Amino acid sequence: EWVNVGSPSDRPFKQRRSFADRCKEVQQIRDQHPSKIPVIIERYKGEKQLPVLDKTKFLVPDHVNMSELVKIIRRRLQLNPTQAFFLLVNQHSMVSVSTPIADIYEQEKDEDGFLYMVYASQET
């Protein structure tokens, strides 16, 4: 009769913050930093092999390409060269995209104005 507790990090960002609150937050952030893209990065629901990230919200400069971003989130997870890691924007593996995230943002962003990314060990 154990009770399994937690965790606020296992709760999706969209359930932690209301749609209205998220829309507001994105608006302030872009005003304060027009230079940057607001990004939400979470572990895939199915994923158990990779560790969970300490943080969820990332402020990314427009010029950074997704190939560069994949490298950054990867060092942060302290992954071995051998571990498989994919960073998906709307279900596409970004470690080949050299396009600036500012261009991805206009095309792929959420209704709330955030750009949402999910990471896992397999691509599908």
Residue numbers in the entry: 6 to 129
Authors' own words:
All six mATG8s are essential for autophagy, are conjugated to autophagosomes and serve to recruit two broad classes of molecules: autophagy receptors and autophagy adaptors.
To obtain the complex structures, we created chimeric proteins consisting of the mATG8 C‐terminally fused to the LIR sequence with a Gly/Ser linker. The four monomers in asymmetric unit of PLEKHM1630–638‐LC3A2–121 overlay with RMSD of 0.174 Å. Partner residues in each mATG8 protein are given W635 of PLEKHM1 interacts with E19 of LC3A with 3.5 Å distance, with D19 of LC3B and E25 in LC3C in similar way, but the bond distances are higher (6.2 Å and 4.5 Å), suggesting a weaker interaction. For the LC3 subfamily proteins, the hydrogen bonding distance of N637 (LIR) with K30 (LC3) correlates with binding affinity to the LIR peptide. However, we observed that in all LC3 subfamily proteins, the surface to which V636 binds was stabilized by an intramolecular salt bridge, which is absent in GABARAP subfamily structure. In the LC3 subfamily proteins (left plot), R70/70/76 (LC3A/B/C) side chains are closer to the CG1/2 atoms of V638 (˜3.6/3.7/4.1 Å), while for GABARAP subfamily (right plot) these distances are 4.6 Å (GABARAP) and 4.2 Å (GABARAP‐L1).
